[PDB]
Nucleic acid binder design. Structure first.
Lengths: 199, 64, 144, 116
RNA sequence: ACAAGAAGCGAACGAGGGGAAGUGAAACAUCUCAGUACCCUUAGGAAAAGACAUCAAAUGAGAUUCCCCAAGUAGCGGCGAGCGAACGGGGAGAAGCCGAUUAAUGCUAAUGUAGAAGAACAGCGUGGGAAAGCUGACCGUAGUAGGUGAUAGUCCUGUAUUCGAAACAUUAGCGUUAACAUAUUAAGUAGGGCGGGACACGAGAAAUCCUGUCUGAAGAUGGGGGGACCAUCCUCCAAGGCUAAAUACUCCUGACUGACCGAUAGUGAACCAGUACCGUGAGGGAAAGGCGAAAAGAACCCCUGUGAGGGGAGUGAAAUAGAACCUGAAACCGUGUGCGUACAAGCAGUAGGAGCCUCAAUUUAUUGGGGUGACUGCGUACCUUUUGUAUAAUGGGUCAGCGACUUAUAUUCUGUAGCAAGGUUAACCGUUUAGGGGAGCCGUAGGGAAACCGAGUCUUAAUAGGGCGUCUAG
């Protein structure tokens, strides 16, 4: 509802997007589906057909006193194919549109509840300097945080591009994992309004 | 993509109802002179597939 | 969420998959629940929908009946409770299509008495049942 | 995610062989023979855990029978005498008195002998 | 008798000429497998197709190709096993022409093929060695790179960033040159008979396309199609040739990535591998990685045959790290110590149990831990398969390593979560897990073969009777 930015100005955010509830089962599924979408799933193994050679019967079925065999590339043999060899596969799941929206509402609401959201009027850097933003985070009491602004600056990107546990994102490229991984979130008032409308 | 195939001949003999399937009765195609007129009358029309047999009909016709 | 550590699936959501042939204690050792020597215990076994072991299957002791009508596949039935998705007051075939009530390839539509309307409508080229007709005009609607 | 089972198999097989120490020949060296020796030992132990209770009562009764017969009656008449005198002393304690304190067992037989 | 080409080889993808069988149908011949494998011909960066003698039947649309739906529907089918559309909707890409050809040459522009610079750390303690510990600094458009004697943004190579080309390919624009091509509306053609083939469509009521054989028009007052066929209506003009993109693929070149492997794995091949080896041949086809940070790879002495091998010395943090070299398991084989064992019959253990030996306490043989096991009782391995196995029924010499319910899609039920009489988008676009995209799907109504009607409906002459439905959660 009514939050206070760093300077002290009064900003009011909708409860439907910033004070909803914590649905852990809902948040877990959306977060874990995002992590499964990070996989590229590129691998394979050879089956019986795929391994080199092994087309002829190694010996006759009866008489030799050995276990019957049909190929030297059997999955029982050393160097043989893999029974159930792996192939490339897709790991991306479907999260329902309302499920993704609801999870982001739950995460942002929970971020406020544990005093991890920081509202600022604006966060701009005069020069593309890492030291300038490192100093601005210190006075903001967030040495490692996730900065969310509208129209991420072309020199604010360079300032944060070297700081270890610090990332600057557009509001339209914020993911559920980023809101949870980082210790704090510095959202501008303008960017908080975007989440108010988009959630 | 790869879809389950309907048994196209089992769909010509079973029709979906609200709570089950319906079907015609047998013994009505030919040699009908020797049958009493009760058989010709009660073998005519629809019955319901038995509870026993409608698991098979569900596997044969997955889309009706 | 709090953290990537304390994110739990909400007990009851996940169930452990069954692995066949992993020892005596697992309950599926040595057979996978397949039983003993038989056709259904073999590697490529299946139930074969439409097979009773040799007697003429049920779908072949009974006769084929009826024919498929092409008209039935282009005639959609419309319910009174679905009309809240229509934009405006006119209820026509083209208007039911833009409301996504009927398929775009449906030629004609029928309005039946299923729910109840909430506003006056004007039906031009759709057939209305006797029960639906009195419910339409009870809300101020008309049929033309 | 290939899983190599060598480490877990090694300590699993070692656990069985450690439990088979002192066995003769292959029963304490090779796992295939030691695993069914360890299982068979556990089966014997489970049955011998019931038989122990069964075997020590035979020992007590025989010791009591010797003690009663040394001075007076037999075991069958001794147990009847203790039962009629409402004496609850168990056969374990009686066999210990008979084998370790003959004066008390002599006095204990008399109480049973006067009761029949 | 003179000039210009071709030849052959080499991945996959295309087009075309031929074309199985195993299998499934619980047999098998129609059918399926499948126009697949294979053989053969031949091209290009793609190929093919492509502008209506096409659909449609709506208010009409407007070439070809590819994707999501339509839909496992309509159909085909020993109507079996199976096979399986199209119309139309949503997208990608859009283009129509009569040379949209090919090959050179010269300018213009941009790449590519070598490169260059590139910040910032010290002290102390431990340590063989510092990058790790403690204290205090610095750079950052450069902080999760690879190394360096252990783990480094500040030691090195690097990274962010800014840039070089004498020369020669490559891409694009303009101009020129020379090779080819440049139809003028289409007769052995459309249609027909016979036999086949292709159409999802197996002759079927079989339209349409192809053609081996035999024939054969009309020719804009005309002709093709609209799934037998006729009439009406609509649509379009074959028998001339072209046409980009969206689509298919990887012998390859670069950059980058991986809940891919890590030496029995991953390529057959991490190593002098298509090798050794086997085969007349086609062909088949292995095994095999690791000293150490640095060879500092052990000068010299001793035993031995100037041998092997070792012991010293030395090097090294380490030498049971010494070259068969990191770690060094098990099977298996020795040596030493303690106990038991040469009068006693068997799945070799188990429950008791004397004695002996050995450690720790304890005021000194009393317990506790460890080893052994005289003697007593009980006791016929395991797996598999069976009515039933110690079975003289199967399998296993042992150890180590590997070895068998998977994956993709469809569907049904259950749980859980979000929304909820609604739920949800797919392909795609997207500055790409967002956002858009509502085509479609499921639910919300059923009855009947169907027309049709609809909380009813079907059967019926019947308003009777009866069948199937009705009075929510997806």
């Amino acid at each position: 509802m009514d939050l206070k930015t760093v300077t002290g100005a009064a900003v009011e955010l909708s409860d439907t997007a910033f004070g909803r509830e914590f649905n852990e089962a809902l948040v877990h599924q959306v977060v874990t589906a995002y992590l499964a979408g990070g996989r590229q799933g590129t691998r394979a193994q050879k089956t019986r057909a795929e391994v080199s050679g092994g087309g002829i019967k190694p010996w006759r079925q009866k008489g030799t006193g050995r276990a019957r065999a049909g190929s030297i590339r059997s999955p029982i043999w050393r160097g043989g194919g893999r029974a159930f060899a792996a192939k490339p596969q897709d790991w991306s799941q479907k999260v329902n549109r309302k499920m993704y929206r609801g999870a982001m509402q739950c995460i942002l609401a929970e971020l406020i509840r544990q005093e991890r959201l920081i509202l600022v009027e604006e966060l701009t850097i005069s020069a593309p300097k890492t030291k300038e933003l490192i100093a601005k985070l210190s006075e903001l009491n967030a040495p490692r945080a996730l900065i969310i602004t509208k129209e991420v600056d072309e020199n604010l990107y360079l300032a944060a591009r070297n700081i270890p546990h610090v990332n600057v994102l557009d509001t339209s490229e914020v993911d559920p994992v980023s809101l949870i991984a980082f210790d704090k979130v510095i959202m501008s008032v303008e960017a908080a309004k975007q989440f108010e409308e988009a959630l | 993509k790869v879809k389950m195939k309907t048994k196209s001949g089992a769909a010509k003999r079973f029709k979906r109802t609200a709570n089950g399937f319906k079907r015609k009765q047998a013994f009505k195609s030919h040699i009908l002179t020797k049958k009493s007129s009760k058989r010709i009358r009660q073998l005519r029309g629809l019955k319901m597939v038995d509870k026993s047999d409608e698991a098979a009909v569900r596997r044969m016709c997955p889309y009706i | 969420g709090l953290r990537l550590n304390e994110l739990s699936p909400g007990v009851g959501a996940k169930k452990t998959a069954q692995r066949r042939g992993r020892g005596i204690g697992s309950g599926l050792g040595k057979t996978g629940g397949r039983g003993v020597k038989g056709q259904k215990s073999r590697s490529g076994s299946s139930i074969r929908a439409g097979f009773e072991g040799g007697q003429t299957p049920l779908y072949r002791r009974l006769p084929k009946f009826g024919f498929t009508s092409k008209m039935a596949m282009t005639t959609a039935e419309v319910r009174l409770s679905e009309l809240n998705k229509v934009e405006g007051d006119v209820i026509s075939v083209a208007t039911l299509k833009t409301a996504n009530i009927i398929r775009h390839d449906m030629k004609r539509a029928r309005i039946i008495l299923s729910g109840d309307v909430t506003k006056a409508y004007t039906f031009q080229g759709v057939k209305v049942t006797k029960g639906a007709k009195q419910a339409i005009e009870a809300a101020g609607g008309s049929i033309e | 995610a290939r899983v190599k089972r060598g480490v877990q198999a090694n300590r699993r097989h070692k656990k069985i062989l450690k439990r088979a120490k002192g066995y003769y020949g292959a029963r304490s060296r090779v796992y295939r023979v030691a695993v069914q020796a360890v299982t068979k030992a556990g089966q014997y132990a489970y049955r011998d855990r019931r038989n122990k209770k069964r075997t020590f009562r035979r020992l007590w009764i025989a010791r009591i029978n010797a003690g009663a017969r040394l001075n007076g009656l037999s075991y069958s008449r001794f147990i009847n005498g203790m039962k009629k005198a409402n004496i609850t002393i168990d056969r374990r304690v009686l066999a210990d008195i008979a084998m370790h304190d003959a004066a008390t067992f002599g006095a204990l037989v008399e109480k049973a002998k006067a009761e029949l």
